[PDB]
């Protein structure tokens, strides 16, 4: 089906305390495969999935070299942005970049992205046509000019439509067993009363991959999501994910309160009634 | 595989 590769980079300044912390992470769908952390032992790009370990030493040197180039740009960016916004040297600030590409079921290019943030809000972004930029404010307008004269969108479009998809396809065949598996959720339903006036009903989806899932509650046909407590999908730690949905329910209608589960590892979607 | 031309903001 549809597949994606993203890289995520975070760089945080440490005023009075030397170089910024730099963390880069690579994913294919919801599966991590590479990391770099500037506080770690190796000082290299490191594998995080078994199917990427089979790359030879030139991959490992190149990626290490390039992630070092990235740390540097972000290092200088923290200094540059602090200048653009006239902030003091006393505070810590955060730079974030995310880039990558989506492919469809036939594995051809669908979409490419390259987003940049300062202090947790949008700074500059590559538009969907991979030709043009959205700048968040007047300070980011300076970067936009700088990158138009550096032909950055042209350089990124070449990567996002070529290299990025070429390399994702390589990862998806190398990682076939892992990356093209689909884990259906092991489902499960629990009752917890409070004081014999109400009852919480909790629907569970455990052990699923990929992370995308929909849980909806429903009072016999019409959906009851004006009561539902829905936690964030959380990692189990073994490559799979967990999520739960709950309604506070009067003592009698638990028969006619149904829980609806949607995940792509299921052929037909699941219905859960309390029994 | 990472992008090869990151450029300063």
């Amino acid at each position: 089906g549809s597949h994606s590769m993203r890289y995520f980079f975070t760089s945080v300044s440490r005023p009075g305390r030397g170089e910024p912390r730099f963390i880069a992470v690579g994913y294919v769908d919801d599966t991590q495969f590479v990391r770099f952390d500037s506080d770690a032992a190796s000082q290299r790009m490191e594998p995080r999935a078994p199917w990427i370990e089979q790359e030879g030493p030139e991959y490992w040197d190149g990626e290490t070299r390039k992630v070092k180039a990235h740390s540097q740009t972000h290092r200088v960016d923290l200094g540059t942005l602090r200048g653009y916004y006239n902030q003091s040297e006393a505070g810590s600030h955060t730079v974030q970049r995310m880039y990558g590409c989506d492919v469809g079921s036939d594995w051809r290019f669908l979409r490419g992205y390259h987003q940049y943030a300062y202090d947790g809000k949008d700074y500059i972004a590559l538009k969907e046509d991979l030709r043009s930029w959205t700048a968040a404010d007047m300070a980011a307008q300076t970067t936009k000019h700088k990158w138009e004269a550096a032909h950055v969108a042209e350089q990124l479009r070449a990567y996002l439509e070529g290299t990025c998809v070429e390399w994702l396809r390589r990862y998806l065949e190398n990682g076939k067993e892992t990356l093209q598996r689909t884990d259906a959720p092991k489902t499960h339903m629990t009752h917890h009363a409070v004081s014999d006036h109400e009852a919480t009903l909790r629907c569970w989806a455990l052990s699923f991959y990929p992370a995308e899932i929909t849980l909806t509650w429903q009072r016999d046909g019409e959906d009851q999501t004006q009561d539902t407590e829905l936690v964030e999908t959380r990692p189990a730690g073994d490559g799979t994910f967990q999520k739960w949905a709950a309604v506070v329910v009067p003592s009698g209608q638990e028969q006619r309160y149904t829980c609806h589960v949607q995940h792509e590892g299921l052929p037909k979607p699941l219905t859960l009634r309390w029994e | 595989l990472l992008f090869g031309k990151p450029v300063y903001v």
Partner: T-cell receptor
Amino acid sequence: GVTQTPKFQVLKTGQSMTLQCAQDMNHEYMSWYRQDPGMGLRLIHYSVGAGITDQGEVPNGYNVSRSTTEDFPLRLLSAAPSQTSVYFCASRPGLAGGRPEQYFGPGTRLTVTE
Amino acid sequence: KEVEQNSGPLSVPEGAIASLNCTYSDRGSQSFFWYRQYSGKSPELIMSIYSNGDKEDGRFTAQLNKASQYVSLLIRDSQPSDSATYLCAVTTDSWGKLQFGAGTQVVVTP
């Protein structure tokens, strides 16, 4: 673009010489090549930013520095006949902006005789 | 041999096609360049290619095939002032060495 100095040089065995190279474009990455008929371009020393240099495949007898981003001199302390070559300075943005391309200096023919 | 070029020299008469080929070894190469050097002067940049397929500019067409690791340069409708040696250049990143081939010399016959 890239300018380099001088265009031609004669030296005897043992003399010292510096080749200048200057660059207009805020390029971080500057490099020094020698070109020879048997073996194309060979990288002597390079620098990915001011203050900072490292060696190529043929660094021996050559000595380099980079206090400013604009300039990247290549020094020979004691010339040998094997240093008879055409030397090219080159520069390239690195992490800086502008056109993502490497450009060359016009070259210095050097000959070393006994 | 990191970057391998076409033997040389290449005689083509004026008006004809000079076809140049080039091979690299690094899978992760992302940038591809053709340089032109007349005898006694410096390599001048003439083509950059970044994506698979053709890039036409004037009488030069570049071609890149990253699966077979192949870079190509065609010179349509040759002239005596195309007589030079043509350098293929390939790199992976911002900080990687630009790898030059030994060059193929093209001689354009009047």
